[PDB]
Amino acid sequence: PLLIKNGEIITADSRYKADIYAEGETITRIGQNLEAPPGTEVIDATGKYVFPGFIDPHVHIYLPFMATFAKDTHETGSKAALMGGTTTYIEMCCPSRNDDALEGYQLWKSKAEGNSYCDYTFHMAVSKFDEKTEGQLREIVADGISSFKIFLSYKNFFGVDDGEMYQTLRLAKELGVIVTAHCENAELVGRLQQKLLSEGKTGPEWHEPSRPEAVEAEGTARFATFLETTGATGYVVHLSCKPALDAAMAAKARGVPIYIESVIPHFLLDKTYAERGGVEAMKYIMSPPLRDKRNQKVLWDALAQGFIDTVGTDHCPFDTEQKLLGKEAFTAIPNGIPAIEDRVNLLYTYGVSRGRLDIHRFVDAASTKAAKLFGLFPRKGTIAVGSDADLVVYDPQYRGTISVKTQHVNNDYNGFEGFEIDGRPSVVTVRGKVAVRDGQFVGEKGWGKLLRREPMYF
């Protein structure tokens, strides 16, 4: 049994002081001065906030990509997540066009079993479409995976054409599945990459120009048009700039059931980081690229007003050594930045503590909204009787800086090296069991379970 007392509870739509008692894995009751049976583990949350466990709807743990593999394992990844306050993560299951989808799903699925410290689930990538695949997708959905993922980029590896996208969306609508999508243009990026390389422009500073804002805007609008035409519900992952936001907003305004996600690096980093040259710049190469800083205000304002629904990380860790695989051509630099451990602290600091982000909008954008969209709610995403006891006792008096020297991500650099944070998790629990106590990791291996969802977007 667990009892968290004297803490100020804050959810997306409530704020109060009371005690939380969890007999087992779920919250049993809430009230003031609760009496917990003897033996109950008591946590004193005096002077601290008690938030629902945070949820990252977009991470990469196991990933064979751009000639190599992402650095975290479900073990190191889930641990880093917990240290950061994230108690549930949704990983992108990404088998390529040449892989068997069902086999890919089972591979990712088995790599996670007994290896995760916190709960998780997947987004099933659809990198090709045919009779064989349709049958396997029906099976994967039936196993509890209620979300797909398509890419409008990465030609021949992940990208699907209009015909495949259309079929994926019709199937999704039939199964009540929500489709997440990476929006760019596979053809344009490929052509622009070749053009720049043939011109001798090989440095990391040509990554952004090879896939400008106009391309993300085109893909975002195309995706919205297919959703509107098929009747399927969609979700745009890591939207990074105004032109794309305008396209997604226009779709929302005319009634298209589409949702928007932005990832932490696009709120705090900008294109100049990728113009520093050398391995230093390679550390900030991702897709969509970091943009002109003028976009940060746009994203922050949109987040405050709820135009942007969720905030994820698109966590994709690589070692500087791996980044150097593209010292000859920027097209060979493995795309990705690590952030699964810093999302919450960064969002809280620069959004709530030093920004205009309302604290309730913060909880909604970093936990509740994602739980709702992907069928994890009310099990996850909030604090209420019946919900899983995934809690985060947050300390707002803490002051420090982020550094690779103190991170738990299995790679050699931190994207936010030196950034200050005005808070951090003091205690983190997973289904009633303490995983982090006073900055000390005390999690239990294999405690995390796979969360199965029910389709709801017909």
Add this chain to the structure above:
Amino acid sequence: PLLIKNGEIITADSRYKADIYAEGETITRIGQNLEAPPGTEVIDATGKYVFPGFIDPHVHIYLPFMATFAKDTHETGSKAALMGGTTTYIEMCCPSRNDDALEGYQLWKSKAEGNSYCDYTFHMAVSKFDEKTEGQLREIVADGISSFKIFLSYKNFFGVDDGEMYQTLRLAKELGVIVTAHCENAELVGRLQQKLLSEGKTGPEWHEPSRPEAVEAEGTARFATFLETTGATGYVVHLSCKPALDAAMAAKARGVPIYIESVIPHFLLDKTYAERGGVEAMKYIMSPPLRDKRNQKVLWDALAQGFIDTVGTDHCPFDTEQKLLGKEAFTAIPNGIPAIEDRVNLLYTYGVSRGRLDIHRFVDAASTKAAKLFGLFPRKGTIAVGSDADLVVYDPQYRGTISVKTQHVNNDYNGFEGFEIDGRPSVVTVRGKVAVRDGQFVGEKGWGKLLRREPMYF
């Protein structure tokens, strides 16, 4: 003591089954199978929803307007509200340009004391600005009223000019007050009214053309520009059409702290109702006017995505006899439609039950958001330990129709006569005390209190 058991609790960010125990006026604890001391009043909510008491941020009880007076009293008005599921209402305190603001405030304030069945508070109208008035506004704010109200229409009676609007906004920013605003154009409406009358166009069907969508759009954009320039936080009341929504959305997108409210009649009624001729058409005359029905989809879609923040009624009851005061000229028809009693059932029915409105967005738009914006939260607007026990046991199995024959509004007609509803309040409580039991009004006169707020928008 009160105990509501076996009900499905639904708030903006939670959904579960548990019992709610309120020892006194606030919720003491929540859990499953709670044991209430003997003597506790037990309500069985089996098979029913338990929502937070709903809040109407825009009503008119006492109102000397257009040569006459609104029909409801705080007694009949609060009763009608409760029957409909609304446990808190914010009334527009409206002294005209020729009245002393402080006296006006005190008049409204005393008419409500001991006469309301549920809690309430006010929006202080600023229909002129000068040294004398500034001093009185500071006093009214200090008395707990944290919101102003200005009109960009009704020349010489309620309307303020750019100079006055600017000063009102600067003062609001200084005091941390949020400014609500009726957005049209006092001059244009006056001119267009005169033009139409001089042309012999006197029927009710000329009301809409006298203040077209372009006018509301102009006023909405003007208001946004003054907010952006003064640094004040604003709130647009009863936004009725796309052009205006576009203007308010553009302001939101560029960072202006502005919020949007729409009232129920603009979601379900349209301009043709005011083109029926005679007293029948006069029943549907209000400002802003009912619009072309193409606007209803726009508003519904915007509500579903959270673009529109709150839903109110702009409740302004008049008898058909009073409406006839303008049988000679439409300009003399007292503007207003009654709706304080039907808002919740209408929104639930056409939004949740038969529409695309998510049930959590429904609670937020009809209760929580308004509580947050006007400083009533967390006291009101949600279900959580510490909050006032304002609850609504809602019956989703109920089926019926709205009719003046069964309303409690103190006038002779219902704007939604004949409309079907797929639910209704079964039990309604105010701070732990039952006011409505099984469709029977059992409220206590004078139980309602004035809610004082703290300024928060500096």
Add this chain to the structure above:
Amino acid sequence: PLLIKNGEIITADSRYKADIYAEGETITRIGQNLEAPPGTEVIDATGKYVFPGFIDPHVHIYLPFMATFAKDTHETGSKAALMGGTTTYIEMCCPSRNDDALEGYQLWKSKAEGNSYCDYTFHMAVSKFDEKTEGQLREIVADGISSFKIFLSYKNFFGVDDGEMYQTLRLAKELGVIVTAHCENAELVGRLQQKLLSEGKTGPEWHEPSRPEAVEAEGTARFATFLETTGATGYVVHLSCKPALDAAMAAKARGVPIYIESVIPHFLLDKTYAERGGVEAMKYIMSPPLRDKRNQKVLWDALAQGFIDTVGTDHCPFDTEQKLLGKEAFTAIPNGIPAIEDRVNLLYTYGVSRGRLDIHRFVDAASTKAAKLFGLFPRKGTIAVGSDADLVVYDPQYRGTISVKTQHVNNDYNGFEGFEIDGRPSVVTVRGKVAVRDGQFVGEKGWGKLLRREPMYF
């Protein structure tokens, strides 16, 4: 020699009364009371307007399409054009994906030689892209054809994919060629067509729903993105609705060198014509489909302000008998409406005479702009010394109605049967030679020549 005297000359940027003297094929001099050598043919234009010969930048004479062939020949087509005041037309050379481009060009080219009454030129369609084709396109451009044409629809027959579109645009930029484009989405239209048919919806009234406005908007925006990314100059053919106009305007506003064309049927006809059922409805089936009439005001306003650059017809004549080829499924109805003969009179009547279209904007939209965009200017498109003596003595006192009974188009129905017109050509000349005198056709077979252009958009 030719002398047109006492006429009021009206061009896009001039208006005056004077005489025009053409010694041979071009205008020799302009002035008042000019003395023409003896033998000169004198035309008295007293009380009439003298416009530059009008130009239709989008017609179909020879066209193997949808299992059949368009009805006009270069002989009947050029004659009908002249009777209507059009002295130059640009035909779409359309070999399909299975045809050899160079052979296709030569086929169209030889069908026109010695068979046209007026001058003409072509837009070279690129329905596929490969090494073989690139070489042939370079040859065709070198032969004087400075414009391409790509289709974003008609899968497997005319439509090109993103890869092919990109390559076509890069080549166009290299050669200084302007690319015209039909903007929809080949995949979406195909899928939506199949869906409707499988649902038993086979009538002509399902044509519009099979390719809604959202699709044209998507293709228009996609095209604009590829122009912006490749640096090529583009031109959107027959833009029919607001969503598409918005997309093209956004591109214009941000600096993309893109131009807009709209065709006469979209200004005067609407979707209901295709909902009349039977062969009557089949007469109004075209692509993009006739739209909701709310779009006509949008197009007219855009034309008046110069947002829409040119007005063409997309003349594609078919007999009702041929239209019946799709009595079983709307997908088999040959798309197209005839209009080459009525464009000028219709535009003049409903635009200038009865609309808000300025007479100079009329000349620019129906003649000069197209001549400029496609390199026919200053040879064609205006009245000035040195220009070809292609003139139209227009009679503004004429009043009549359009009817198939008096048309010269080689088919059995007129799309504007019964429409009134407030003017008509009295005299029409081609390079100094009279082709139409007092409504009598006196043209000379084979007089028309192929106009070769110089590339100018690098």
Add this chain to the structure above:
Amino acid sequence: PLLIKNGEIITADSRYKADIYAEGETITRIGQNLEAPPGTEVIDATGKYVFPGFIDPHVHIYLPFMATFAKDTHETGSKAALMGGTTTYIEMCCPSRNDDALEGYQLWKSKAEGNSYCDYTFHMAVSKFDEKTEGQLREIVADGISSFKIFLSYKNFFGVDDGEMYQTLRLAKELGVIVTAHCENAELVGRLQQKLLSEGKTGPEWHEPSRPEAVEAEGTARFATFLETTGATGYVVHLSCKPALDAAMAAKARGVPIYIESVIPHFLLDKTYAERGGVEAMKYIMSPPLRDKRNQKVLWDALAQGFIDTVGTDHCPFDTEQKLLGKEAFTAIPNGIPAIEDRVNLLYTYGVSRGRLDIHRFVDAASTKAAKLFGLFPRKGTIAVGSDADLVVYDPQYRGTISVKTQHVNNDYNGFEGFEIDGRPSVVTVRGKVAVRDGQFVGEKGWGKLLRREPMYF
């Protein structure tokens, strides 16, 4: 008699080589190898362009403003205009609120008689509205002035309120007059000015912040709303930024008869010039203020596509000594920059020679469009038989720089000091009489006449 031979004639819709013969004040005939009677003055235009005399629709010669007077006289002003290629200018007749409108008109009118080297006309400012004024405006219009001018700024001196603006527009519609307007917000500018001064911010660098882009956008949109509501035709003077352009474009798109003008300094100068401090910065203080340079591309692109209709100067010359009148407070710096003499060369150089501005669009934006809008066409604005012989033989081989040392404007500084130009007028004529020959001024005092217009916008 005048004969200009061997020149390449370029108008907005024609380009050719021929001779122009003017027997008297108007062009008599055009053709190749024309024979002029003996005594005819012959100008050889070999290797040069022959443009229509350029027209500046917005200048200030006589102006009592901000405690002082503008430096040019109709003598020095018209001379400077001619040297620059401008043969017709429209001056803003600006009596303030305290002046009698009719007297003001007559004052301006008499100051110009016999004192202008080239033709001219006026825009009648309406700085207040009442019965007395309406009567005088009817008289002024009857005297040939077909355009009004209202200011939405300069409180109590020039600015009119909504009531006055509405009445001015209704009268304009009745008389068929077009209304030009300076769009900002009198109240907001006044308040923001006071706020900044009270904060000790007195330097020239606070001018822009005192009237930000949001204000011009608000005024532009307000003006458009009143035009749309009254049915009057409008024209926005010196539009300087994207937000305002967006507002004016939206109005154009929905059918409002509104036109846009931008002045040369907003295309080439930016806000930093006014941040140089001291008298140097004061030289660049005008209204609307110079903006962030990001706006220059927007304006250039809009001009190339015809979104911006005309290009003027808003010529308002002051001596540095006069500028110093506001060394204590920026609000006292007389607003204005000189440019009447450099407009054409600057537009030609940076638009045509070094930009993307098409040469025909150049002639239209600098001459023809303005002539059309203000009823000067076809008398002025083009080259054609019957038109006034106002011609400009332009030399495209000339290369030089602009300097106060060689200007003819009656003040001590040039706003474009040091700017390079790729052309200049070689010969300039006014109604058949040479005013400038090979850079030498040979004009005749009092030759210029007042141009009376006919109302056309009912």
